[PDB]
């Protein structure tokens, strides 16, 4: 995935071949591990973009993306 930013915050452009794998990227505050559980398809015009909240010792609820060290934005296409 391509690591960029959205208003100072890290942003992940996730491609199709990353479905099912732990997303890791270094940050001043250590290594960040986001988990993507998404309709994740091929990167195209039909993108969706939203935030993966920070979750410390809390079970996830009503979400398919979350990181454990620093909240991150994520973007991926839905095409197939």
């Amino acid at each position: 995935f391509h690591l960029t930013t959205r208003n100072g915050e890290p942003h992940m452009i996730v491609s199709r071949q990353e479905k099912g794998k732990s997303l890791l990227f270094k940050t001043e505050d250590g290594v960040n591990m986001c988990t993507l559980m998404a309709d994740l398809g091929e990167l195209c015009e039909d993108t969706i973009t939203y935030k993966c909240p920070l979750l410390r010792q809390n079970e996830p609820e009503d979400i398919d993306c979350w990181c454990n060290s620093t909240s991150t934005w994520v973007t991926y296409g839905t095409c197939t």
Epitope: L3, E9, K26, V31
Partner: antibody, heavy 118, light 107 residues
Framework: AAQLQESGPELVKPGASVKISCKAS????????INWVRQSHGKSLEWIGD????????TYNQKFEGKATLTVDKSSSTAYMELRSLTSDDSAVYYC???????????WGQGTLVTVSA | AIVATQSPAIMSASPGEKVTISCSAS?????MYWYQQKPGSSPKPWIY???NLASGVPTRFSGSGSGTSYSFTISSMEAEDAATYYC?????????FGGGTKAKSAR
Amino acid sequence: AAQLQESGPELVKPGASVKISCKASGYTFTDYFINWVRQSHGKSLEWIGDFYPNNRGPTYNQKFEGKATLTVDKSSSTAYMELRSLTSDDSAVYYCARGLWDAWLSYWGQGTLVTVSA
Amino acid sequence: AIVATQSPAIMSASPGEKVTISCSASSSVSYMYWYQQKPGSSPKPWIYRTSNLASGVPTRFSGSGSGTSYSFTISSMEAEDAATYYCQQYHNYPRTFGGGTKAKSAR
């Protein structure tokens, strides 16, 4: 164990170009931003660049757009700054600091002095 | 695309005094920093976010602010404080520095 190792001090003539290296170690080079930083003698710091070595996206401070050109070699975990058409005002230190998610310069290099002189 | 403007350019102080150093951004950011730079040394990070100490920073330093205002505070100056200190913003592209504040000993 995070370290940045800049090149050594450079003279140089006006109209020359220089080519400052940056050699990261003790972290995933691809994972973090690389940020050059002018400081002239008796001035403050002056941000210049930022280069994400996963995808080789720059940005530039407008003031240094046309003056600088950032580039990274993944293979050697090295960042490079060219400076072009050097003038006496370009005489400064140039520090390479890595970011850590946000724009926060959390590890600096030892700083390359460049000294533009006739 | 935002300037940062840091309040005393200088600053005389004596050991024990409680220095304060402000930073004023031309639009609302939440990601700042305060570096510290010694006469023949790299800058070091001292504050991160708007109020996070960096690890291996004395609890003598503190950072607070929001809404374009931002403020370093040195709660009882040590000899080893004497330095420049340096706001950033890292909330929009061209990451900006302030013009630096130059805390020097007095007598």
